């Protein structure tokens, strides 16, 4: 069963981190812009998701994803680690929160753990 | 419905505090250690489970939960903090893992967005 995830950041360098350790979980497909991903219309398992974004914050496009497929299951990577950025992600309709720099064996294991669902 | 939480760790603090922060999502039911956990043979939605334990490893109960009622969501929370232990906890099957000293409104929201699955 390859599953669907997507990779939300307008860094190139986490797009591919992300996106080739995901990679052997199923198809990945990587955006640089919340625009970018909106116009993939397509349903994903899993969204790993920034949450500093050039155009749209990754809280808007994560309530956007649940308002459209409560199922998925949706993780914000950021930068942001600050107690009051966790509650509003979570507040968001976050199914998880993680911090950069990321463990990706720890990213892959909360992938994993989601898709067991 | 009633979502039913558990909470086993042998800080009676840690027990007491988050049963508190947590009643307001349903009933909260606490253990001092792993033993008297396993002898209860009722059901939980969310199992807030402690690693380091006088008796058990969070680990080890993990699995046994996994082995038993795998719908049950695990969230470990403990003073271990390394990569490597927090690796260990999804290895054991957790779904989440929570490190001390740890935001309670955090938790809170963690436990939530489980029961809402
Ligand atoms: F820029 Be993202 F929020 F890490
Ligand atoms: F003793 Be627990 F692992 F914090
Ligand atoms: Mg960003
Ligand atoms: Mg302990």
Redesign the interface.
Known sequence: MMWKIAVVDDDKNILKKVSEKLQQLGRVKTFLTGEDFLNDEEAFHVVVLDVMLPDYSGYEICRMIKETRPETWVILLTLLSD?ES??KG??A????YVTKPF?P??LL??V??FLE?
């Open positions: 107690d966790v509650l979570f507040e309709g976050a199914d998880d463990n064996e720890i294991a909360r994993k753990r669902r």
